[PDB]
Design a protein around this ligand. Structure first.
Ligand SMILES: Nc1nc2c(ncn2[C@@H]2O[C@H](COP(=O)(O)OP(=O)(O)OP(=O)(O)O)[C@@H](O)[C@H]2O)c(=O)[nH]1
Ligand SMILES: Nc1nc2c(ncn2[C@@H]2O[C@H](COP(=O)(O)OP(=O)(O)O)[C@@H](O)[C@H]2O)c(=O)[nH]1
Ligand SMILES: Nc1nc2c(ncn2[C@@H]2O[C@H](COP(=O)(O)OP(=O)(O)O)[C@@H](O)[C@H]2O)c(=O)[nH]1
Ligand SMILES: [Mg+2]
Lengths: 119, 431, 50, 426, 302, 426
């Protein structure tokens, strides 16, 4: 006959692999879906529709090549015009600022230590 | 953030014997003191790390009989506990509050205190103390209250979460437990901050009904008590959606400085095959946490009115369904709440589901609820105990023992009238 | 301040762990799709051999 | 140029801020490492409002995150877009208040507020022309509500001329987390009526039934709610960040919406929000946006606006649209439901249009209404506060730290007087 | 009230809605998979390039290691060859520095593990008398730099070590440049190969022997010390855990692992005794052995 | 050309000097083998200030190490950078002083000073046009302070027209190593005020404070503090070694910071000092350097200058910088906090710019402030000296050696009236 405490607390159930099986850490991830996917409107096979054009640059600068009309660039209910509303105006006329600041970041990254200012 | 635990008496240290098994399982620590094979702080609140791959618990076992303590020293967890932390007197208190409070306490408590001081010194972000004792005995009652007094005069502002094993109305394993329970309560009142009661009849009925085990020992009781303790410290241990610390029970559950006595409940208590049976959702367990057939203290809250409730949730639970369930609870009328407190719930959520001990009777559940509530059914309980106290005291039975240890009738009388004042206070606030 | 530094190390450990867990979680969904289609073709084969 | 300094307080504030800086970083095209990788230069010209050039394209946010428990700081540095916050901006205590407004306003603040004031100072003079401050926090907690309102008071007595937006969640009875929600909420709103410039009232009950009815989710966890609030905060600030046909900054919105100095508690909406099973059903046009905007089930507060009147309102439109359709839609929604608007102010609706819709959408709109149905929410809180204080319940945890009872009496008088004046102007 | 939940397959409740939400979620993963921009497949190609079957070469039959062959560097005490990932280089504005650690789990000859010896030629300004060797073999006390096989991209070349080479360097302990987890000189693979910091020296461990063995051909299996020639400080195993992607490695830094046994340097210096002219011996963690290649194959010149 | 001779005394002096020569040899690219291997020819032109060509480019430093226990010298020659010092320069006694100023100034100086004076006089007359001497030593130990002060006495007796720096660490009560700290410190200070040209007071208390707060370091051993002190010493002599837009050598700084011949106890700070986790999240702008430079918790002494007035201040900048932003930032910090500056001197801030940054950095700074908050420290030491001397503790190890009691009275009186004249000029 053995003592009650030793009849209950033993080493068979522990320390082999069950510790690994019981240290799951299920509390860590608990993944949510995402933030954007709840609010996105549009088909999901395509990238999100980012509009990076403003009415001034679109009309007064005539960013789009073909200057049709002021109200053509606005969003209407009708597909008759919604097909031809432009989303993004790509060109150096926009990218001049990133060109400048990327030149600046490049000259920040690549520097010579031993260049006195006078010389 | 760290918390240390002290176990007093013969019940406290067996409860701890279950509790630390559960903790080593939950943090993946071998019974000989180290993990098999990083950079995880989740264990830090319960186990300190020493030397090379060695984790020693932040608890102090202490008892006056060396039997159970060196039984632990010879048990499975020899390398785990610190040789100094287990503390063992030479002879018991023997169901005698005065003997455990004046004779042997005066020489054991100083060692215990200059030991717990070094524990707190090695600790860094101490949340507070939590004590495990039973007031029906001599050691845990007398030296329990003595160490509580001295802890309060040393630190005071740090919370002292006290899990106390009160005696049952009809099931009794002693004779002078009325005297001892009264004398312990008389100091528990103004030294404990959040005192949680754990009976034995209620847990026996739980193991009979839910776990359908028919001939239970103390091991099963202590195992599910450890389940409850771990479920209420899971918020400190792990990162959930809405965590609640040790001070939250002090804030949200103690409306008046002498009303801190909490009924506790746990759900779902389910065995292996019934796990396969039942579809575990949140509404049925939030309901199950409120029937008297699932409270850890045998009393009827239908006769009482609630003051506050706190609900720790563990596992795959989101706030949506718990919100819906507590709304259904509030709109039900079978249970009731004090008119003056109009918002009597406090939720807390932690992501990790409770673990299962090999050889245990509980099954792997997806989610669990630990409810800690306040009511006046406890004011009923104290009167039920008061009656049987005065019955014995009228004839001065068993008093010669205490007065031979050194006390007098003054303590008996003042504790009796203090319990009476407490009765009046509960009957006043249940307005 | 010393404890702040001690946490500053574990933060990097956590970052690497989380990256790894995410990169495994994606392959989990990949394998779920694979197993769905595999069971489909399995039942298709079982049907025609009878 | 015009600068917004963002402040996050408490657990709710930290998590909302995390999703907020995720969305803003998306809109400016900065990758989670901290470098610019967008396409156009409409994004580059207005990043100084929310970020700072460190060096070599390293744009770090101008945010101050404060709390008292490391649990939030770990969750912040865990997820992506958690590596871009400046380590010096993690001002962070160690004890933890935990649902005690007095610990959040007298004890822990007394040693933490100086350090966060040092960081907030250094952050405010690092930029030149403040537009103001924008702080997201809670009202039920301790380390968010008490600590935040103390910081609000401190910064409002130092910088009296800058704007101030406070995105504060409010407790609801049906969705009630803690027990001392009233004891904290009333004292916090009592501080906000004298320090904040305008408050945007949020709550979890309205966010939940929005995710039930409109968004039609199964488990609307906190990640989705925080993103809805994130979409709102980005929508309210879009006017500074992008050029548009009719710009309207924060102070321009404040003067168009605040008729009286104590009437500055708004209710907020966001459009469009539709279920993913019904995305293709709806066109993208102003009438469809407006019908969803003025609905009572799209407000982000637990106040039926048809139970009162609108004093003023505002609609911030994003996207290439026609202003006639904008103005005629406002005129129709004001003339049809003319009983719901006050009579002694004509043209109760302010409008604005910017040219950049948020990423993934074609056209969006944000509603900000100063209605008088907000007194129903404050009565709902004050009636619970009068219940507990009469019995002096739960009170000793507060009084045992520096607070007295008359402070609670002042909170009662202010709330009763505020709902009195809203009821007056109805 | 409350009713039971069901799987997505069965149609009940808002089955349409959860099914559609899932449809969109999965469509996103598919589109990204077509593009190739997922986190998963992002570094799978990097793993293919960084861990590939590599065979070490020798330029000649003789056992001594020769300049320009592909060699390994391994710690004698615990194996754990040294290797630096080209990715996860520190991010700053003017810094191309890339961290290098010691991998215990990966010891098989791989592209990233392999070092390639480059001869160091002193500039004209440098004021250093150098023993002249004509043969291509490397000796003791001779300046040498070490680049690593191109694990990022490109093809190896005899001395260029790819189009852009990254060589072993270490800078003294300043506020900027310090090892990440301990306070010693960091050791990395910078792209500025022409800087003097990248030069190293191979010295026999025993203090007494080295003077007599000043110039002699170095063998493969012999244990030797790698000392930074600009700081004269050996290479050491830091014994601190390092969490990079390939595995949990050990930090590597440059310290003089000296046993704290004092030497009466001053008294012996005044006396002029022979024993005086010696640095204190280094500890066992400083020892490194080159692992040479059995087969013979010269690499193509630049 | 203009030459600097280095002199180190004591254990603190030997370990500071070891790290100092490691940094300077790094700045000029010379390896511990003794040979130049740098790239830019800007480094050859000004090494004669510190080195001497021996044979085949062997440049040995112009330093003299002195102490009484070989323990420090063994640590010097043990590791790297131990093979560059000439063995003749290791002038070295054998008995030991041991925290006894009397031993270090009368009984052990008597037989060591002949040898060091021979070595220093030979190493000084070896170069043509001395700029001055430099001394690094401690004020707690005996062979550092005792021998240091005796050597200063004999040197200023011989070469009076050359400059003389003294980097001295004063013992703090919060970081207090020894017990006879006051008895050494006060006697050394009484000697310094009469013979040293100018002194720059360091302290380990403020240095530990910096490595905790700003640098965010894990285990700050003495190697780190030695690196900080060395960064100061390289910064103070940068302008001699590299061409700049506005040069300022030691004599130029001394004349612009010492208004009265006894007010030569400067306080020092260094900039920039940021943790490596916070290095990427910052820019490098002159305000970014000035904010940290004038910060109170950045001084390398245990005296908050906000308790006093800046008599004069000096700023030494390194890097390709814009002089306009340098001058206006000095002007703004002078005009905003106009209470911390004295009244009877306008333009209290001498400034200088050099074009070569310290290695590994883009742009740095070095602060030298002559304040009247230093009399906090002298009082903090003098009160302990009075507390001991009232009851003659530890006195006999001094009195029974040749030293008398009147030396203690004059030391305390000169300590007292120095503090009184600092207090008078505030
Ligand atoms: N639930 C539970 N109760 C226990 C356990 N062990 C003891 N008890 C209770 O403890 C009460 C008596 O106190 P004990 O702990 O046995 O003895 P003591 O507190 O040390 O006092 P002394 O016997 O005088 O030393 C009994 O009524 C039991 O119900 C246990 O393991 N589980
Ligand atoms: N909307 C939203 N609310 C939250 C989130 N996290 C917590 N909360 C709310 O915060 C309130 C409690 O705030 P609390 O954590 O106590 O604030 P603190 O303790 O002072 O930081 C609860 O009512 C929650 O509903 C979140 O991610 N989103
Ligand atoms: N900063 C710094 N202080 C030191 C160092 N070594 C000693 N000290 C300080 O110097 C004081 C004692 O100097 P001490 O060794 O007695 O000088 P010595 O005996 O004359 O050589 C103590 O307060 C130490 O803190 C060092 O390497 N760096
Ligand atoms: Mg007992």
């Amino acid at each position: 006959p053995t003592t009650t405490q030793k009849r209950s607390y033993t080493a068979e159930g522990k320390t082999g692999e069950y510790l690994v099986e019981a240290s799951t850490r299920h509390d860590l991830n608990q993944p949510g879906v995402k933030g954007e996917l709840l609010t996105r409107h549009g088909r999901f096979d395509e990238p999100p529709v980012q509009c990076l054009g403003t009415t001034y640059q679109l009309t007064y600068g005539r960013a789009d090549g073909t200057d049709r009309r002021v109200q053509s660039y606005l969003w209407h209910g009708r597909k008759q015009v919604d097909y031809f509303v432009p989303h993004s105006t790509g060109g150096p006329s926009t990218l001049s600022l990133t060109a400048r600041k990327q030149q600046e970041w490049g000259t920040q990254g690549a520097t010579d230590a031993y260049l006195t200012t006078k010389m | 953030r760290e918390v240390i635990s002290i176990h007093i008496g013969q019940a406290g240290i067996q409860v701890g014997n279950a509790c630390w098994e559960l903790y080593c399982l939950e943090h993946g620590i071998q019974p000989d003191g180290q993990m098999p094979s990083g950079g995880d702080d989740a264990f830090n609140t319960f186990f300190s790390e020493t030397g090379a791959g060695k984790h020693v618990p932040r608890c102090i076992f202490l008892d006056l009989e060396p039997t159970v303590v060196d039984e632990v020293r010879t048990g499975t967890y020899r390398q785990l506990f610190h040789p100094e932390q287990l503390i063992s007197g030479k002879e018991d208190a023997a169901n005698n509050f005065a003997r455990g409070h004046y004779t042997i306490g005066k020489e054991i408590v100083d060692l215990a205190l200059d030991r717990i001081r070094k524990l707190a010194d090695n600790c860094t972000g101490l949340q507070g103390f939590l004590v495990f004792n039973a007031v029906g005995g001599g050691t845990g009652s007398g030296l329990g209250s003595l160490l509580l007094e001295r802890l309060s005069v040393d630190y005071g502002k740090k919370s002292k979460l006290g899990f106390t094993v009160y005696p049952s109305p009809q099931v009794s394993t002693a004779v002078v437990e009325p005297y001892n329970s009264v004398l312990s309560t008389h100091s528990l009142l103004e030294h404990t901050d959040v005192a949680v009661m754990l009976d034995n009849e209620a847990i026996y009925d739980i193991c009979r009904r839910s776990l359908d085990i028919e001939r239970p020992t103390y091991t099963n009781l202590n195992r599910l008590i450890a389940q409850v303790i771990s479920s209420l410290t899971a918020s400190l241990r792990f990162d959930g959606a809405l965590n609640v610390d040790i001070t939250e029970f002090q804030t949200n559950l103690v409306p008046y400085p002498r009303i801190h006595f909490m009924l506790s409940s746990y759900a779902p208590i389910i065995s292996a095959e019934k796990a396969y049976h039942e579809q575990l959702s949140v509404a049925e367990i939030t309901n199950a946490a409120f029937e008297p057939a699932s409270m850890m203290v045998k009393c009827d809250p239908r006769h009482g009115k609630y003051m506050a409730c706190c609900l720790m949730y563990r596992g795959d639970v989101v706030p949506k369904d718990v919100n819906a369930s507590v709304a259904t609870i509030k709109t039900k009328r079978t249970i009731q709440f004090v008119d003056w407190c109009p918002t009597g719930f406090k939720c807390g959520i932690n992501y990790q589901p409770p673990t299962v001990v090999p050889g245990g009777d509980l099954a792997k559940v997806q989610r669990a609820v630990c409810m800690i509530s306040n009511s006046t059914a406890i004011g009923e309980i104290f009167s039920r105990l008061d009656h049987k106290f005065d019955l014995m005291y009228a004839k001065r039975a068993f008093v010669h023992w205490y007065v031979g240890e050194g006390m007098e009738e003054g303590e008996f009388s003042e504790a009796r009238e203090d319990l009476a004042a407490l009765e009046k206070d509960f009957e006043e606030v249940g307005a | 301040y010393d404890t702040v530094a001690a946490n500053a190390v574990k933060d990097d450990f956590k970052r690497k762990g989380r990256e790894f867990k995410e990169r495994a979680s994606e392959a989990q969904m990949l394998e779920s799709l694979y197993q769905s289609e595999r069971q489909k073709t399995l039942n298709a084969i079982r049907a025609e051999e009878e | 140029m015009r600068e917004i300094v963002h402040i996050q307080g408490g657990q709710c504030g930290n998590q909302i801020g995390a999703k907020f800086w995720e969305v803003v970083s998306d809109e400016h095209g900065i990758d989670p490492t901290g470098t610019y990788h967008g396409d156009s230069d409409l994004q580059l010209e207005r990043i100084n409002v929310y970020f700072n050039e460190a060096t070599g394209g390293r744009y770090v946010p101008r945010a101050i995150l404060m709390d008292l428990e490391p649990g939030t700081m770990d969750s912040v540095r865990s997820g992506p877009y958690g590596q871009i916050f400046r380590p010096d901006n993690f001002v962070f205590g160690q004890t933890g208040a935990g649902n005690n407004w007095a610990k959040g306003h007298y004890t822990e603040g007394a040693e933490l507020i100086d350090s966060v004031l040092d960081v907030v100072r250094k952050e405010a003079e690092s930029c030149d022309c403040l537009q103001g401050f924008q702080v997201c926090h809670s009202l039920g907690g301790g380390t968010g509500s008490g600590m935040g309102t103390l910081l609000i008071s401190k910064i409002r007595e130092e910088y009296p001329d800058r704007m101030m937006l406070t995105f504060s969640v409010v407790p609801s009875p049906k969705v009630s987390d803690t027990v001392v929600e009233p004891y904290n909420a009333t004292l916090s709103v009592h501080q906000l009526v004298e320090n904040a410039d305008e408050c945007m009232v949020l709550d979890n009950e309205a966010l939940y039934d929005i995710c039930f009815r409109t968004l039609k989710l199964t488990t609307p966890t906190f990640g989705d709610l925080n993103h809805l609030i994130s979409a709102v905060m980005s929508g309210i600030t879009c006017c500074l960040r992008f050029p548009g046909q009719l710009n309207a900054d924060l102070r321009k919105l404040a003067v168009n919406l605040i008729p009286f100095p104590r009437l500055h508690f708004f209710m907020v909406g966001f459009t469009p929000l539709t279920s993913r099973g019904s995305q293709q059903y709806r066109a993208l046009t102003v009438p469809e946006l407006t019908q969803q905007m003025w609905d009572a089930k799209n407000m982000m507060c637990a106040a039926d606006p048809r139970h009162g009147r609108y004093l003023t309102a505002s609609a911030l439109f994003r996207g290439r649209m026609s202003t006639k359709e904008v103005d005629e839609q406002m005129l129709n929604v004001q003339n049809k439901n003319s009983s719901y608007f006050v009579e002694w102010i004509p043209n109760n609706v302010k409008s604005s249009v910017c040219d950049i819709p948020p990423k993934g959408l074609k056209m969006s709109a944000t509603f900000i209404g100063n209605s008088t149905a907000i007194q129903e929410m404050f009565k709902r809180v004050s009636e619970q506060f009068t219940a507990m204080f009469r019995r002096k319940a739960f009170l000793h945890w507060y009084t045992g730290e520096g607070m007295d009872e008359m402070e609670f009496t002042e909170a009662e008088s202010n709330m009763n007087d505020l709902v009195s004046e809203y009821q007056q102007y109805q | 009230r409350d009713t039971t939940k069901y799987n997505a397959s069965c149609l009940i409740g808002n089955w349409a809605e959860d099914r559609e939400l899932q449809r969109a979620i999965l469509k996103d993963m598919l589109s990204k998979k077509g593009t190739g921009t997922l986190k998963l497949d992002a570094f799978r190609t990097r793993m293919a390039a960084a861990l590939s079957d590599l065979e070490l070469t020798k330029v000649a039959d003789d056992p001594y290691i020769h300049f320009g062959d592909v060699v390994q560097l391994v710690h004698v005490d615990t194996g754990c060859v040294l290797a630096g990932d080209p990715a996860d280089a520190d991010t700053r504005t003017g810094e191309s520095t890339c961290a290098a650690t010691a991998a215990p789990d990966v010891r098989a000859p791989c592209p990233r593990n392999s070092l390639i010896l480059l001869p160091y030629v002193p500039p004209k300004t440098a004021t250093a008398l150098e023993p002249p060797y004509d043969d291509a073999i490397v000796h003791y006390g001779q300046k040498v730099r070490l680049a690593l096989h191109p694990g990022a991209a490109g093809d190896p070349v005899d001395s260029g070590g790819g189009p852009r080479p990254v060589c072993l360097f270490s800078k003294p302990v300043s506020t900027t440049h310090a090892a990440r987890y301990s306070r010693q000189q960091l050791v990395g693979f910078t792209a500025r190969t022409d800087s003097f910091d990248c030069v190293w020296t191979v010295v026999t461990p025993d203090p007494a022997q080295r003077a007599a063995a000043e110039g002699v051909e170095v063998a493969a299996g012999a244990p030797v010390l790698l000392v930074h020639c600009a700081t004269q400080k050996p290479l050491c195993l830091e014994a601190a855990r390092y969490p990079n992607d390939y595995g949990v490695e050990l930090e590597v830094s440059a310290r003089s692992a000296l046993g704290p046994g004092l030497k009466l340097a001053m008294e012996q210096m005044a006396m002029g005794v022979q024993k005086g002219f010696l640095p204190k011996g280094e500890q066992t963690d400083n020892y490194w052995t080159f692992v040479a290649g059995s087969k013979v194959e010269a690499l193509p010149p630049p």
